[PDB]
Design a protein around this motif. Structure first.
Motif, PDB file in Angstrom:
ATOM      1  N   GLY A   1      -1.431   1.222  10.648  1.00  0.00           N
ATOM      2  CA  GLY A   1      -1.216   2.443   9.504  1.00  0.00           C
ATOM      3  C   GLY A   1      -0.938   3.402  10.135  1.00  0.00           C
ATOM      4  O   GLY A   1      -0.219   4.553   9.592  1.00  0.00           O
TER       5      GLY A   1
ATOM      6  N   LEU B   1      -4.298  11.910  -2.148  1.00  0.00           N
ATOM      7  CA  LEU B   1      -5.645  11.064  -2.122  1.00  0.00           C
ATOM      8  C   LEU B   1      -6.338  11.197  -0.843  1.00  0.00           C
ATOM      9  O   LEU B   1      -7.693  11.405  -0.542  1.00  0.00           O
ATOM     10  CB  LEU B   1      -5.545   9.990  -2.642  1.00  0.00           C
ATOM     11  CG  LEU B   1      -6.784   8.975  -2.931  1.00  0.00           C
ATOM     12  CD1 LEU B   1      -7.672   9.562  -4.060  1.00  0.00           C
ATOM     13  CD2 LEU B   1      -6.445   7.636  -3.256  1.00  0.00           C
ATOM     14  N   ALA B   2      -5.814  10.847   0.175  1.00  0.00           N
ATOM     15  CA  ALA B   2      -6.102  10.430   1.602  1.00  0.00           C
ATOM     16  C   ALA B   2      -6.830  11.960   2.151  1.00  0.00           C
ATOM     17  O   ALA B   2      -8.021  12.000   2.597  1.00  0.00           O
ATOM     18  CB  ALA B   2      -5.256   9.822   2.696  1.00  0.00           C
TER      19      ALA B   2
ATOM     20  N   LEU C   1      -9.054   6.772  10.122  1.00  0.00           N
ATOM     21  CA  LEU C   1      -8.187   5.912   9.019  1.00  0.00           C
ATOM     22  C   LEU C   1      -8.987   4.687   8.839  1.00  0.00           C
ATOM     23  O   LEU C   1      -8.858   3.951   7.885  1.00  0.00           O
ATOM     24  CB  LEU C   1      -6.664   5.578   9.869  1.00  0.00           C
ATOM     25  CG  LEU C   1      -6.052   4.916   9.057  1.00  0.00           C
ATOM     26  CD1 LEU C   1      -5.803   5.125   7.640  1.00  0.00           C
ATOM     27  CD2 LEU C   1      -4.677   4.804   9.704  1.00  0.00           C
TER      28      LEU C   1
ATOM     29  N   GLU D   1     -10.013  12.634   0.309  1.00  0.00           N
ATOM     30  CA  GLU D   1     -11.152  11.855   0.926  1.00  0.00           C
ATOM     31  C   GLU D   1     -11.553  12.216   2.124  1.00  0.00           C
ATOM     32  O   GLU D   1     -12.532  12.044   2.442  1.00  0.00           O
ATOM     33  CB  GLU D   1     -10.615  10.303   0.871  1.00  0.00           C
ATOM     34  CG  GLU D   1     -10.624   9.477  -0.491  1.00  0.00           C
ATOM     35  CD  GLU D   1     -10.806   8.002  -0.322  1.00  0.00           C
ATOM     36  OE1 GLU D   1      -9.959   7.272   0.216  1.00  0.00           O
ATOM     37  OE2 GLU D   1     -12.102   7.524  -0.634  1.00  0.00           O
TER      38      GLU D   1
ATOM     39  N   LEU E   1      -0.830   8.788  -2.400  1.00  0.00           N
ATOM     40  CA  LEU E   1      -1.619   8.339  -1.254  1.00  0.00           C
ATOM     41  C   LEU E   1      -1.911   9.340  -0.197  1.00  0.00           C
ATOM     42  O   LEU E   1      -3.303   9.644  -0.018  1.00  0.00           O
ATOM     43  CB  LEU E   1      -1.032   7.202  -0.743  1.00  0.00           C
ATOM     44  CG  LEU E   1      -0.679   6.136  -1.702  1.00  0.00           C
ATOM     45  CD1 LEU E   1      -0.300   4.725  -0.797  1.00  0.00           C
ATOM     46  CD2 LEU E   1      -1.635   5.591  -2.466  1.00  0.00           C
TER      47      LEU E   1
HETATM   48  C1  LIG Z   1      -0.774   0.412   2.529  1.00  0.00           C
HETATM   49  C2  LIG Z   1      -0.680   1.726   2.932  1.00  0.00           C
HETATM   50  C3  LIG Z   1       0.592   1.934   3.716  1.00  0.00           C
HETATM   51  C4  LIG Z   1       0.788   2.996   4.509  1.00  0.00           C
HETATM   52  C5  LIG Z   1      -0.298   3.702   5.029  1.00  0.00           C
HETATM   53  C6  LIG Z   1      -0.893   3.064   6.217  1.00  0.00           C
HETATM   54  C7  LIG Z   1       0.388   5.102   5.499  1.00  0.00           C
HETATM   55  C8  LIG Z   1      -0.783   5.967   5.873  1.00  0.00           C
HETATM   56  C9  LIG Z   1      -1.808   5.534   5.066  1.00  0.00           C
HETATM   57  O1  LIG Z   1      -2.901   5.221   5.916  1.00  0.00           O
HETATM   58  C10 LIG Z   1      -2.512   6.775   4.026  1.00  0.00           C
HETATM   59  C11 LIG Z   1      -2.855   7.810   4.543  1.00  0.00           C
HETATM   60  C12 LIG Z   1      -1.189   7.448   3.305  1.00  0.00           C
HETATM   61  C13 LIG Z   1      -1.194   4.396   3.961  1.00  0.00           C
HETATM   62  C14 LIG Z   1      -2.070   3.569   3.430  1.00  0.00           C
HETATM   63  O2  LIG Z   1      -3.081   4.187   2.748  1.00  0.00           O
HETATM   64  C15 LIG Z   1      -4.425   4.036   2.752  1.00  0.00           C
HETATM   65  O3  LIG Z   1      -4.815   2.949   3.295  1.00  0.00           O
HETATM   66  C16 LIG Z   1      -5.165   4.848   1.972  1.00  0.00           C
HETATM   67  C17 LIG Z   1      -4.481   5.919   1.061  1.00  0.00           C
HETATM   68  C18 LIG Z   1      -5.402   6.789   0.547  1.00  0.00           C
HETATM   69  C19 LIG Z   1      -6.543   6.756   0.422  1.00  0.00           C
HETATM   70  O4  LIG Z   1      -7.353   7.654  -0.133  1.00  0.00           O
HETATM   71  C20 LIG Z   1      -7.309   5.688   1.228  1.00  0.00           C
HETATM   72  C21 LIG Z   1      -6.591   4.973   1.936  1.00  0.00           C
HETATM   73  C22 LIG Z   1      -1.572   2.566   2.397  1.00  0.00           C
END
Ligand SMILES: CC1=CC[C@@]2(C)CC[C@@](O)(C(C)C)[C@@H]2[C@@H](OC(=O)c2ccc(O)cc2)C1
Ligand SMILES: CC1=CC[C@@]2(C)CC[C@@](O)(C(C)C)[C@@H]2[C@@H](OC(=O)c2ccc(O)cc2)C1
Lengths: 239, 9, 235, 10
Positions: C208, C47-48, C82, C51, C44
């Protein structure tokens, strides 16, 4: 449901009649205050405002049409947003200052509070910049009550409840438009101001979440007095 | 809850 | 001084935003279903991070954005990043009820979310937003408008140009709804409905952010310096 | 100083 049957003017009248009072703090200019005792004035005041808020909520069209469990949930999620927008509304006529109470008007000059303080001032400036009207304010406040917790509620029966909230929300939107049209705004202007007003709620939600974290920190430091009701509302947000 | 009771009146 | 954004027509605005759209990226290609915090959060955050780079270049193509000073551009992105990641996630997930499509090769349900402390709460909020978008039949043209609104709005108070551009996008949203055949009443009702969702999206971002903060302090899943700085900006 | 500031320039 008596709520859905109301006309726009009836909606505004009902909301105006349901407005809670402006309360006084225990501030005393002859008494010295620490950062913690000053904060104590605010938590005491907020607690008392909450009691009035809970009874105000009962007079918001549609709220009592909801189960007790759903009312509890909505108030638990929106309480701080509502206190804050109320504070901003009081401070609208006081550039650079926050009117926590008629006897308590502070500027940014007078402990980790400055950040949120500035956000509230910015919102107040925004209201003033928009020339926010009292009729619009009461609409915004009821929208927060119904909206903030609606997406964090089981069965298809529990889904029917959320549907009712959406219909009431739509009705309040109709009321906002009605108010703007009467104000002589063009259709384009009505749509723009509606957007401007609703975008406010995003910033208010943001201040609420920041405030909840400051409030949790205050509890843990165990120096500032927090009421039982306040502690329960806080716990509801599971920080 | 307190909020629960107050809502019940 | 005069910004080109305000001189743009509704159709011109819509095409600019559509054309600016970043692509849908893929995650690592290991066929294992992640359940542990380490593996899942690794995917994640990676990926983030990827992105984010696209988001930054997307933002520069949002009409009126580059007319701001670099400092203002930095501020807005720091506050909105975010929320923008999340609305994108929700959008991709719309046609997949009960699941979050982080990437075409990374579709997850809440069962995998509940295996990570404090994740499922945010997970369910994301699912609720997706389901809501689906029931409203949100259109891609509307989606891109909402995303740009977030970019310009989220940090706009923590500061005339931005508010005029925001008005311009409101005009565009209505334009799209009228173009789709909605009556006057349906138009403002739908406008309100969409904007109210932005409140919930702000809520999800704040939660988040706190979750990302604890992740950082637990120091298990390595975070890029870019992701660390975007987090650090929120104090 | 900030990566974001650099990326906004690139
Ligand atoms: C349900 C989640 C819980 C934990 C969080 C809030 C922690 C940080 C998070 O925002 C992501 C940056 C890792 C993640 C969330 O991830 C995303 O929302 C996300 C992750 C990767 C992407 O490319 C886009 C959004 C997933
Ligand atoms: C700028 C401030 C910072 C600290 C916080 C966020 C902590 C919690 C707070 O929201 C309040 C409940 C005392 C407070 C803020 O107080 C209010 O928002 C407030 C206080 C009393 C009221 O009756 C209404 C609002 C003051």
């Amino acid at each position: 449901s008596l709520a859905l049957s109301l006309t726009a003017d009836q909606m505004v009248s009902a909301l105006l009649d349901a407005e809670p009072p402006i309360l006084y703090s225990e501030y005393d200019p002859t008494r010295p205050f620490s950062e913690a005792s000053m904060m104590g004035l605010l938590t005491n005041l907020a607690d008392r405002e909450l009691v009035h808020m809970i009874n105000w909520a009962k007079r918001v069209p549609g709220f009592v049409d909801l189960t007790l469990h759903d009312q509890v949930h909505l108030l638990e999620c929106a309480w701080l947003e509502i206190l804050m927008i109320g504070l901003v509304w009081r401070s609208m006529e006081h550039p650079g200052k926050l009117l926590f109470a008629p006897n308590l008007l502070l500027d940014r000059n007078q402990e980790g509070m400055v950040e949120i303080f500035d956000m509230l001032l910015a919102t107040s400036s925004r209201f003033r910049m928009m020339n926010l009207q009292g009729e619009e304010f009461v609409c915004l406040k009821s929208i927060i009550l119904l909206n903030s917790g609606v997406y964090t509620f089981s069965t298809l029966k529990s889904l029917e409840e959320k549907d009712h909230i959406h219909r009431v929300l739509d009705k309040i939107t109709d009321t906002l438009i009605h108010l703007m049209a009467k104000a002589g705004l063009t259709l384009q202007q009505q749509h723009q101001r509606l957007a401007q007003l609703l975008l406010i709620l995003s910033h208010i939600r943001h201040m609420s979440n920041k405030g909840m974290e400051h409030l949790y920190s205050m509890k843990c430091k165990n120096v500032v007095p927090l009421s039982d009701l306040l502690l329960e509302m806080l716990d509801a947000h599971r920080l | 809850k307190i909020l629960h009771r107050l809502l019940q009146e």
